[PDB]
Amino acid sequence: IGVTSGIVLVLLIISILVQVKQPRKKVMACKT
Amino acid sequence: LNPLSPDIWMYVLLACLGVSCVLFVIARFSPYEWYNPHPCNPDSDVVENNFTLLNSFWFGVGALMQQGSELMPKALSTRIVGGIWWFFTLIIISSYTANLAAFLTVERMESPIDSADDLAKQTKIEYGAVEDGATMTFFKKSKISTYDKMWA
Amino acid sequence: LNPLSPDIWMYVLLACLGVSCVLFVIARFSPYEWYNPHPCNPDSDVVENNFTLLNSFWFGVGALMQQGSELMPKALSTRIVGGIWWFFTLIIISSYTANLAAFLTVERMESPIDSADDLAKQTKIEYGAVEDGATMTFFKKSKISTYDKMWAFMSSRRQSVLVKSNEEGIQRVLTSDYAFLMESTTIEFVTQRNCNLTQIGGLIDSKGYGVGTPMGSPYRDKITIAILQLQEEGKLHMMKEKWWRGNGCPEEESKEASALGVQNIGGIFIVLAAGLVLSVFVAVGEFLYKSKKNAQLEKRSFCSAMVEE
Amino acid sequence: LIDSKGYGVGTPMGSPYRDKITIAILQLQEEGKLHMMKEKWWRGNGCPEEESKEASALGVQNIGGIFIVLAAGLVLSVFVAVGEFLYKSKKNAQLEKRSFCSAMVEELRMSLKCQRR
Numbered sequence A: 001i002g003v004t005s006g007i008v009l010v011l012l013i014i015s016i017l018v019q020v021k022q023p024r025k026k027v028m029a030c031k032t
Numbered sequence B: 001l002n003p004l005s006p007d008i009w010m011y012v013l014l015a016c017l018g019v020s021c022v023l024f025v026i027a028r029f030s031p032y033e034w035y036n037p038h039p040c041n042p043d044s045d046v047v048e049n050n051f052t053l054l055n056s057f058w059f060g061v062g063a064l065m066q067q068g069s070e071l072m073p074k075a076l077s078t079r080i081v082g083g084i085w086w087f088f089t090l091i092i093i094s095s096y097t098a099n100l101a102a103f104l105t106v107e108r109m110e111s112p113i114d115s116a117d118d119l120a121k122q123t124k125i126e127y128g129a130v131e132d133g134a135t136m137t138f139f140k141k142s143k144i145s146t147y148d149k150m151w152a
Numbered sequence C: 001l002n003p004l005s006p007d008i009w010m011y012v013l014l015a016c017l018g019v020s021c022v023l024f025v026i027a028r029f030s031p032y033e034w035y036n037p038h039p040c041n042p043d044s045d046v047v048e049n050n051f052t053l054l055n056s057f058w059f060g061v062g063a064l065m066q067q068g069s070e071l072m073p074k075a076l077s078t079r080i081v082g083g084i085w086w087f088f089t090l091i092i093i094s095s096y097t098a099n100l101a102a103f104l105t106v107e108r109m110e111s112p113i114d115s116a117d118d119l120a121k122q123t124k125i126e127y128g129a130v131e132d133g134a135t136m137t138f139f140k141k142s143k144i145s146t147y148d149k150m151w152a153f154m155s156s157r158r159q160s161v162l163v164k165s166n167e168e169g170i171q172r173v174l175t176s177d178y179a180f181l182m183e184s185t186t187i188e189f190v191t192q193r194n195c196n197l198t199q200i201g202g203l204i205d206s207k208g209y210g211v212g213t214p215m216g217s218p219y220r221d222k223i224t225i226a227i228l229q230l231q232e233e234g235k236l237h238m239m240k241e242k243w244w245r246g247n248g249c250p251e252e253e254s255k256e257a258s259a260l261g262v263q264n265i266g267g268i269f270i271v272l273a274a275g276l277v278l279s280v281f282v283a284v285g286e287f288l289y290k291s292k293k294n295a296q297l298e299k300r301s302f303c304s305a306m307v308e309e
Numbered sequence D: 001l002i003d004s005k006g007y008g009v010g011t012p013m014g015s016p017y018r019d020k021i022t023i024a025i026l027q028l029q030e031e032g033k034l035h036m037m038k039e040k041w042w043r044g045n046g047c048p049e050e051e052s053k054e055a056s057a058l059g060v061q062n063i064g065g066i067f068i069v070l071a072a073g074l075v076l077s078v079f080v081a082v083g084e085f086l087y088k089s090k091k092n093a094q095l096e097k098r099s100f101c102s103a104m105v106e107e108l109r110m111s112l113k114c115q116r117r
């Protein structure tokens, strides 16, 4: 629990930083 | 909430946070999930992606609870994520509901000894009668096997 | 993974490859599945078919796992394929989850030895008998293959494995890793009082007790009569049931509550994590097949990859 | 076993052989020949083993015949894709004044596998 909840926390921070920095509809194909 | 151990209820709940972040990264990374909207106007560079961080987490929860959701994945890449999360939540529920039969009863708390036979073989439970009575004198002057061990 | 036999898990997995190839052929062959897209522009000979080889295999897997998929079939022909694959996966899962109740409560380990054959070949488990007994003297004067190797072990180690009594044998089974060779009427008494111990294998030989008399005594023809009389009256069984029973040890004819853990289900977190490591090899594998087809439309496939990142 | 008994070479009452047969049985028993002879006769056909109270997973013997009704539902469906092919070509005749090459050019369009047209 101590190790894998850090790994999931890594995947959670990346998935936020992809969500904030990306206009999911606008033009942006093939990004990240 | 018992038929899975409290480390499994944490490993399932970390898997929903796990797979939905894996599904959101792959859906934005895969070039086939970026479909073109507006089929009525099929000439614009406005290709969109329906997987948000919302909809990725509610494909993970929506398939965990057998009801399913919107946004079936559209790729060879995001359907292996969705296809292996359907096999995960198939077994976790089939392991839950096949173990929950034992935890809605048990067998409602019976006694460790149920006769004088079971009570003769145990040293864990002490037992006696009234001294100088007719119950002590029964075991004193008996010679049947069980009721003489209870006087020994 | 047990409630279906490993030929059924192969017949299910061949049925998904079976039906999805049958569904893809029929969907391209049927003239009613070829619907006309662009309803906003309903005049063009551009009738399309949504069943690819991808989407046919992910109607087969998507309906195998109860969640369903996109592309419900649209025909009288492709809905008999889809309609009979829904009845197939209904019964396979209803047969799985109604049998999985019996396989989550379970068995335990089986001992490293199961006979004197398995115990002869191992040096990992030491073993001995009582010194100057009739069990040691059996292996001393034997010449059969297995029971002479078991004396080749003991004669090298007579200060270590050959205990002095039956009580020093039982304690070294408990306190150590040891495989004491005791006669079968003492094992029936010890392995009912103690519940740590068991009888490995059957009987090595067949022997028997007996009231010993001096060489030529007139009592051995009177003890023989008075034993055969007690045996038909049932007193030699009545005395043995008085002593050799004791505590009639169970443990696991009860099989109580036992919530599931990492010990029971456990390894699906393996095949979950083995399916995601497979998928990151594919997102790279789609990245390379796209950049290879980016080399056709344009130039410098490597920098065509770097711009989109 | 109801009781416990045993065989034995019977000798007359007071024969000098019963103390020599007794020796020659106890000699054969420690050499393992009284077990070697019993394994020669009492085995015969070793009539197949029972697979008692354990697991009993599901095989082709139990569920089994759903692979029949799966395969019987697909042979039904290929009769229908032909049956849709003939009802379409019959209604293709009412706009084309029956040709029977209409059924050819239709099954040409099957081999236009391009996700479209």
Ligand SMILES: CCCCCCCC/C=C\CCCCCCCC(=O)O[C@@H](COC(=O)CCCCCCCCCCCCCCC)COP(=O)([O-])OCC[N+](C)(C)C
Binding pocket: A016, A019, A020, B053, B054, B057
């Ligand atoms: C009780 C359990 C609940 C769990 C839910 C957690 C998953 C879901 C959580 C959050 C979902 C993400 C929100 C994205 C919405 C998109 C909107 C947008 O386009 O831009 C927005 C930027 O706003 C953001 O993008 C915020 C994202 C940063 C933080 C997200 C994770 C927070 C972790 C939380 C804890 C993690 C632990 C989770 C486990 C507990 C601004 O636009 P708008 O003003 O919003 O207008 C929208 C409409 N319009 C764009 C068309 C105009």
Ligand SMILES: CCCCCCCC/C=C\CCCCCCCC(=O)O[C@@H](COC(=O)CCCCCCCCCCCCCCC)COP(=O)([O-])OCC[N+](C)(C)C
Binding pocket: A004, A008, B011, B014, B015, B017, B018, B019, B022, C262, C263, C266, C267, C269, C270, C272, C273, C274, C275, C276, C277, C278, C280
């Ligand atoms: C982008 C990155 C993607 C990956 C992460 C994405 C996040 C995922 C989201 C959530 C994380 C996953 C589940 C939650 C936490 C794990 C829970 C757990 O118990 O551990 C499990 C796995 O972990 C191990 O213990 C290691 C086992 C080694 C082999 C695992 C295969 C992975 C490599 C792939 C091979 C390539 C295959 C390629 C195709 C063939 C199993 O534990 P255990 O050891 O069995 O328990 C001990 C049993 N005992 C106590 C009885 C002794």
Ligand SMILES: CCCCCCCC/C=C\CCCCCCCC(=O)O[C@@H](COC(=O)CCCCCCCCCCCCCCC)COP(=O)([O-])OCC[N+](C)(C)C
Binding pocket: C011, C014, C015, C018, C019, C022, D060, D061, D064, D065, D067, D068, D070, D071, D072, D074, D075, D076
């Ligand atoms: C195959 C042709 C189908 C064509 C499309 C397939 C394409 C691919 C799609 C699916 C592929 C099928 C699954 C793949 C693996 C096969 C399953 C298996 O291994 O054993 C199965 C074999 O059963 C069969 O496969 C069919 C056998 C003939 C059916 C007998 C009755 C005829 C009814 C049809 C006519 C009615 C017409 C309609 C009426 C309205 C189990 O059966 P069994 O083992 O023999 O029985 C056990 C006996 N035992 C106890 C001794 C062991």
Ligand SMILES: CCCCCCCC/C=C\CCCCCCCC(=O)O[C@@H](COC(=O)CCCCCCCCCCCCCCC)COP(=O)([O-])OCC[N+](C)(C)C
Binding pocket: B080, B084, C013, C016, C061, C267, C270, C271, C274, C275, C278
């Ligand atoms: C219907 C779709 C296709 C289905 C495919 C079926 C494949 C299976 C066929 C046969 C299975 C038998 C051979 C497997 C290898 C044997 C090794 C083994 O024992 O298991 C090992 C690996 O186990 C796995 O990881 C499972 C195999 C991969 C499953 C995940 C990817 C496929 C699912 C998505 C499909 C997408 C791909 C399809 C095309 C894009 C686990 O044990 P261990 O790691 O060695 O040790 C752990 C240590 N411990 C024991 C102490 C805890």
Ligand SMILES: CCCCCCCC/C=C\CCCCCCCC(=O)O[C@@H](COC(=O)CCCCCCCCCCCCCCC)COP(=O)([O-])OCC[N+](C)(C)C
Binding pocket: B032, B075, B076, C017, C052, C053, C054, C057, C278, C281, C282, C285, C286, C289, D115
């Ligand atoms: C374990 C297996 C893998 C192991 C490899 C390990 C490392 C992995 C390394 C590399 C991974 C492999 C290459 C990377 C992927 C790129 C390919 C691609 O472009 O896909 C494309 C085509 O794809 C297809 O047409 C085929 C898919 C149909 C079969 C689905 C798989 C199941 C087969 C079961 C296998 C047997 C099961 C037996 C089980 C024992 C998908 O995109 P598209 O269709 O072109 O777009 C639609 C077109 N449209 C836009 C006009 C609408």
Ligand SMILES: CCCCCCCC/C=C\CCCCCCCC(=O)O[C@@H](COC(=O)CCCCCCCCCCCCCCC)COP(=O)([O-])OCC[N+](C)(C)C
Binding pocket: D068, D069, D072, D073, D076
């Ligand atoms: C869509 C259609 C798909 C059809 C595919 C599957 C069809 C069947 C495929 C394979 C079946 C294989 C048959 C076994 C061998 C023949 C024996 C036999 O016939 O049994 C008996 C009849 O039994 C009955 O009385 C019931 C009638 C049959 C079921 C009704 C069809 C369901 C249609 C669904 C409607 C769909 C609409 C529902 C809503 C969607 C007669 O024999 P017996 O002497 O009495 O018994 C001895 C048997 N023994 C000799 C083997 C020992």
Ligand SMILES: CCCCCCCC/C=C\CCCCCCCC(=O)O[C@@H](COC(=O)CCCCCCCCCCCCCCC)COP(=O)([O-])OCC[N+](C)(C)C
Binding pocket: C032, C075, C076, D080, D083, D084, D087
């Ligand atoms: C379990 C076993 C199965 C039981 C199920 C039985 C249930 C009854 C089954 C079907 C009942 C049919 C009702 C018709 C629907 C009414 C609408 C209408 O009038 O126009 C229809 C007639 O136009 C056509 O071209 C006919 C094609 C209909 C589908 C195939 C049935 C005839 C197959 C002939 C050969 C059969 C071979 C037989 C071999 C022996 C067009 O409708 P559509 O095609 O859908 O496309 C337009 C869609 N829309 C209407 C929404 C716009």
Ligand SMILES: *[C@@H]1O[C@H](CO)[C@@H](O[C@@H]2O[C@H](CO)[C@@H](O[C@@H]3O[C@H](CO)[C@@H](O)[C@H](O[C@@H]4O[C@H](CO)[C@@H](O)[C@H](O)[C@@H]4O)[C@@H]3O)[C@H](O)[C@H]2NC(C)=O)[C@H](O)[C@H]1NC(C)=O
Binding pocket: C174, C175, C176, C177, C196
């Ligand atoms: C589950 O099964 C385990 C192995 O199958 C078993 O582990 C064994 O435990 C015993 C202790 O009871 C270990 O004995 C040790 O080894 C030396 C060998 O010389 C002993 O002398 C030593 O002290 C002994 O301990 C006795 C009990 O504590 C005591 O009477 C004396 O002091 C005596 O000297 C060590 O303790 C043995 O090696 C272990 N086997 C292994 C590791 O393979 C577990 O006990 C058993 N648990 C249960 C709950 O059944």
Ligand SMILES: O=S1(=O)NCN(C2CC2)c2ccc(F)cc21
Binding pocket: C206, C207, C208, C209, D006, D025, D026, D029, D034
């Ligand atoms: O040692 S004995 O007296 N004679 C030999 N045997 C073995 C069955 C040959 C038996 C078998 C069972 C016994 F109780 C005694 C003996």
Ligand SMILES: O=S1(=O)NCN(C2CC2)c2ccc(F)cc21
Binding pocket: C208, C227, C228, C231, C236, D004, D005, D006, D007
């Ligand atoms: O008839 S016997 O000589 N005496 C009785 N017994 C033992 C008491 C069981 C046995 C047991 C095994 C035998 F082979 C013979 C006899």
Ligand SMILES: C=C(C)[C@H]1CN[C@H](C(=O)O)[C@H]1CC(=O)O
Binding pocket: B129, B130, B132, B133, B134, B135, B136
């Ligand atoms: C209270 C006492 C000692 C009496 C009562 N009747 C029994 C008798 O008359 O022997 C005894 C109880 C018993 O034996 O448990």
Ligand SMILES: C=C(C)[C@H]1CN[C@H](C(=O)O)[C@H]1CC(=O)O
Binding pocket: C129, C130, C132, C133, C134, C135, C136, C165, C166, C181, C182, C183
């Ligand atoms: C404990 C001892 C020395 C005795 C017990 N009966 C066997 C006997 O009947 O000679 C011996 C044990 C043995 O040799 O396994």
Ligand SMILES: *[C@@H]1O[C@H](CO)[C@@H](O)[C@H](O)[C@H]1NC(C)=O
Binding pocket: C193, C194, C195, C196
């Ligand atoms: C062996 O079984 C007894 C019960 O007879 C139990 O008390 C004990 O904990 C077990 N283990 C050992 C090492 O004695």
